[PDB]
């Protein structure tokens, strides 16, 4: 079971970002609920930003013109078409730019989960290159939770890890 | 032993970006409405004035065939058909007709 | 045709729901309506790229 570098997990259902483990006591998936909630807060504000900007106060009810008011009719048509072209442009561009930034945002955040793990494990685990780390020391459920919580006690497992490393 | 990853799903919804097209994503929001019911509805409880076969000129000048409209004093909007026939039954020029239609659009 | 329905936005082709910011149904509307855009789709990403391992 490889991580983010090869593809996603269909076995992880409680958040967008998270962890998977295999240990003596068992295995499974669990979400990183703080990285996921912060990502959600960001995305929710982004969705609302799109909604708030596109505020329509425009009246499109048309007007009739006479046979001798063609210049006015054509000016009115030009105005309606010009505003439509501009708003169509703005709506499409805003959505494409935001979709692209959103995908980069999420890719950045999964990378950050990976980096905050190697910054704790350091030489106590082998970085594999498939989005996972192999602890040199034997690790139980309590140290797995400690790494996920950002509280890993590196010194505590340093001697065992060195011997195996 | 410890792996870092992200959620995968069975969604087939796709989005576009500038560099790539038809990217499948796990969650998305459709921001565009593309359908309608095909009917004229009340707006906040009030019915439109339907002119039937009457033009606006017919309705306002009165027209022997627009008698069903003389009793309706209030409305939410006015609905005219594509080609009304019961307009100015006695032929003539209606002065500032278009301008009257604009005035009656706020009534 | 007229019916007994109630809507917040009415277009000449029929009433619409008006819950999303944009529509592509018709440029002329009456009521509390979405912006008219000449686009086929405006779908926004909220989630992740969906590539299972």
């Amino acid at each position, epitope marked *: 079971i490889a991580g983010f570098i090869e593809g996603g997990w269909t076995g992880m259902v409680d958040g967008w970002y998270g962890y998977h483990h295999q240990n003596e006591q068992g295995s499974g998936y669990a979400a990183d609920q703080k990285s996921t909630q912060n990502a*959600i807060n960001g995305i929710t504000n982004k969705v609302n930003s799109v909604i708030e900007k596109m505020n329509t106060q425009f009246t499109a009810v048309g007007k009739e013109f006479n046979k001798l008011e063609r210049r006015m009719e054509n000016l009115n048509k030009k105005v309606d078409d010009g505003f439509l072209d501009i708003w169509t442009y703005n709506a499409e561009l805003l959505v494409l730019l935001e979709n692209e930034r959103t995908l980069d945002f999420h890719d950045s955040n999964v990378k950050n989960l990976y980096e905050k793990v190697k910054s704790q494990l350091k030489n106590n685990a082998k970085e594999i290159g498939n989005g996972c780390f192999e602890f040199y020391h034997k690790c139980n459920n309590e140290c797995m939770e400690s790494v996920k919580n950002g509280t890993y006690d590196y010194p505590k497992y340093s001697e065992e890890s060195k011997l195996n490393r | 032993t410890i792996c870092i990853g992200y959620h995968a799903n069975n969604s087939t919804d796709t989005v576009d970006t500038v560099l790539e097209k038809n990217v499948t994503v796990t969650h998305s929001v459709n921001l565009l409405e593309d359908s309608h019911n095909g009917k004229l509805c009340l707006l906040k409880g009030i019915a439109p004035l339907q002119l039937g076969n009457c033009s606006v000129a017919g309705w306002i000048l009165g027209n022997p065939e627009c008698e069903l409209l003389i009793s309706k004093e209030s409305w939410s909007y006015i609905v005219e058909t594509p080609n009304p026939e019961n307009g100015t039954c006695y032929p003539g020029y209606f002065a500032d007709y278009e301008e009257l239609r604009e005035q009656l659009s706020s009534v | 045709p007229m019916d007994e329905c109630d809507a917040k936005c009415q277009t000449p082709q029929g009433a619409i729901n008006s819950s999303l910011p944009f529509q592509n149904v018709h440029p002329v509307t009456i009521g509390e309506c979405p912006k008219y855009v000449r686009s086929a789709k405006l779908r926004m990403v909220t989630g992740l790229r969906n590539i299972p391992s």
Partner: antibody
Amino acid sequence: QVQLVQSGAEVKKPGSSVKVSCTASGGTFSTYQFSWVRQAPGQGLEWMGRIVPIQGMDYAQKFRGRVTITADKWTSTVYMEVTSLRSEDTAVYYCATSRSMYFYYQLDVWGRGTTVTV
Amino acid sequence: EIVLTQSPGTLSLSPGERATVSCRASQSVTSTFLAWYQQRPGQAPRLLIYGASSRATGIPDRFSGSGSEADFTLTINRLEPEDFAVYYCQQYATSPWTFGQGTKVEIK
């Protein structure tokens, strides 16, 4: 922080429908997920259904076909209509919003609730 | 469906004493989808714990909880006069969302 405001109490005769509502304030209505929860006198809480105005809706199966839950972003108000009322429908109906169950999380903002008597 | 059974129906203790409330699900449920609520008579439910264990904003250190699979517990240390209320077990993992009966705490 959202401040939900609810409508007053209702008294109905059997067979009629009741519409109750919650007004959201202090945030953007469209992305809040609004749940309706009922509590019969002397009983625990029961979930009836949920609306995400910009995304979709769901219902408790017991009320599917009797309860319609809708929303209006223009007045920032969520409505629930319960049809074919029966004498067991004497519960207090509350709104609550989730923290983030646009996608994944629990209910942490609650309104005061409205009593419906049948 | 996911069915939540709470126990005891009524818990009774001296103020300052520790209370626990048990909840058992009909099926195993991921802990991310559990929550606990406190309903003081005359009031709408307040969120205490979200997920099996995270404490909600504005809720004091007296409250904590944990569990796994189908078995979860709410812990209230040093229970105070304002905590003699009814606690509810709720899960949002699948539709329909489900609630337990509720556990009342009495003053003795």
